[PDB]
Design a protein around this nucleic acid. Structure first.
Length: 46
DNA sequence: TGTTTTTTATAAGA
DNA sequence: ATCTTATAAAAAAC
């Protein structure tokens, strides 16, 4: 199954996340479940 | 109708 | 309420 978000997008979200933005809007906006996000970017990694 | 890869809800957190 | 995390069920591929 295709990863939820291509590499680039990671580079993109990795940013937003480190500048603030909530793991929920991103999830929403990017159309991907919150759990997926805590997976790619664990809380203990910011 | 079957295997594999990744998602994603969900339940649980000395 | 809230935020995190591992998981267990299943979707999305072909």
């Amino acid at each position: 199954r295709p990863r939820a978000i291509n590499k680039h997008e990671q580079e993109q979200i990795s940013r937003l996340l480190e500048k603030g933005h909530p793991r929920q809007q991103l999830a929403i906006i990017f159309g991907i479940g919150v759990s997926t996000l805590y997976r790619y970017f664990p809380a203990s990694s910011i």
